[PDB]
């Protein structure tokens, strides 16, 4: 079977069993035509920052590879070096640099070139491989302030250094390439720092592109994950008040009661988060069986704002294909 059964104390049938050698029939040999016929993609939602889509009739290894590549192998642009001029804040320089490196930047990674590490620092950063962001905030006491006010936004002028203060400074040909798509943070309301009068922040951040495995600030996804499609089988009819109890073991939109026969039936198993409450009660034993479809993945890819989640998934598929091609083209050394 292909249904991961869910019991009250254990999870059964979790390993894929589609390969020759599993049975004497010697079936499930790799055929690209059968996979092309069986594989399906169903898009349920496609927003600017979130995509939800079902992959049907694909193996667990490939879906997990897609998830891992989206998390740690798809490049994105984040701040890497911070040069400080007169950081007078109570926030330390290391903490402020870390926070600036953690903001997401709305830069297409395809427009930047990878930075050669072995090159010296005098010629390491070019206009093709570095984006310079300037921050300059001074806090002054407000003269036209309310008499009895206590809000920091009225007693002071720049008491909150936000992410939108990271202005973009074009360098060289970036004045033309970045003309229609200026560099802005994806979340301009990020509270980078708080100030009081007499305090000043002035800094230049060099931003490069890297992969999420090196540092978590380069991951282009808020979260990239999948969950198998739940499956509830009502083996025997459940009628009457118990059916109402059978409705309370699940989220409200999962299982409904027919008006005519007054019996419970599954309405939307997608909403069914597996809390396995129904297995606690002895009255529903030998009446309900829970499982998950092993080859029905529901990907929910939430982007960090740099680029669209569908682009992230496409880049992950392309990265896996390029890894396979690179290993195929390499010679084998003894």
């Amino acid at each position: 079977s292909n249904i991961v059964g869910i019991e009250y104390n254990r999870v059964t049938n979790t390993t894929s069993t589609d390969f020759p050698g599993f049975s004497k029939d010697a079936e499930n040999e790799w055929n690209v035509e059968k996979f092309k016929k069986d594989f399906e993609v169903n898009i349920s939602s496609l927003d600017a920052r979130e995509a939800n889509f079902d992959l049907i009739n694909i193996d667990t290894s490939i879906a997990n590879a897609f998830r891992r590549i989206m998390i740690s192998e798809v490049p994105s642009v984040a701040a890497e070096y911070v040069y400080f001029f007169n950081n007078t804040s109570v926030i330390q320089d290391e903490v402020l640099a870390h926070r600036i490196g953690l903001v997401p930047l709305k830069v297409d990674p395809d427009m930047l070139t990878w930075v050669d590490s072995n090159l010296p620092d005098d010629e390491k950063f070019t206009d093709e491989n570095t984006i310079v962001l300037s921050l300059n905030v001074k806090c002054t006491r407000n003269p036209d302030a309310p008499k009895g006010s206590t809000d920091p936004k009225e007693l002071y002028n720049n008491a909150h250094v936000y992410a939108r203060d990271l202005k973009f400074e074009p360098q060289g040909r970036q004045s033309t390439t970045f003309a229609d798509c200026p560099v802005v943070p994806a979340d301009p309301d990020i509270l980078l720092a708080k100030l009081r009068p007499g305090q000043e922040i002035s800094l230049k951040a060099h931003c490069i592109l890297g992969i999420g495995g090196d540092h978590a600030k380069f991951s282009p996804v808020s979260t990239a994950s999948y969950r198998l499609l739940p499956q509830i089988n009502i083996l025997q009819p459940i009628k009457g008040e118990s059916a109402r109890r059978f409705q309370k073991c699940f989220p409200p939109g999962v299982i409904g009661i027919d008006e005519g026969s007054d019996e419970a039936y599954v309405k939307d198993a997608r909403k069914d988060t597996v809390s396995r409450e129904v297995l606690r009660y002895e009255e529903f034993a030998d009446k309900v069986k829970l499982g998950r479809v092993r080859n029905h993945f529901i990907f929910n890819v939430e982007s960090a704002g740099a680029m669209t989640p569908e682009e992230i998934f496409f880049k992950s598929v392309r990265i896996l294909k390029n890894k396979a091609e690179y290993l195929k083209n390499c010679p084998i050394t003894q």
Binding site: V90, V103, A186, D187, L191, R196, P197, A216, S222, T223
Partner: protein, 69 residues
Amino acid sequence: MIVPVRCFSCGKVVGDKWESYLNLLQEDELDEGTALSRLGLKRYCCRRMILTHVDLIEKFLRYNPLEKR
């Protein structure tokens, strides 16, 4: 001392929800459990980021050394 920019577990940007959370509790008088849901924090790892946050920056800023106290 200040709200983290990103949630530790997943990576969601929760640093921009602090001011809105404070406004929802102060102005709209919403409970803490509904203000978090109104800000898009569904996963509990993100909810504990600004539900457990102790804003020590305001207390530290009382002792500013470049301006009389």
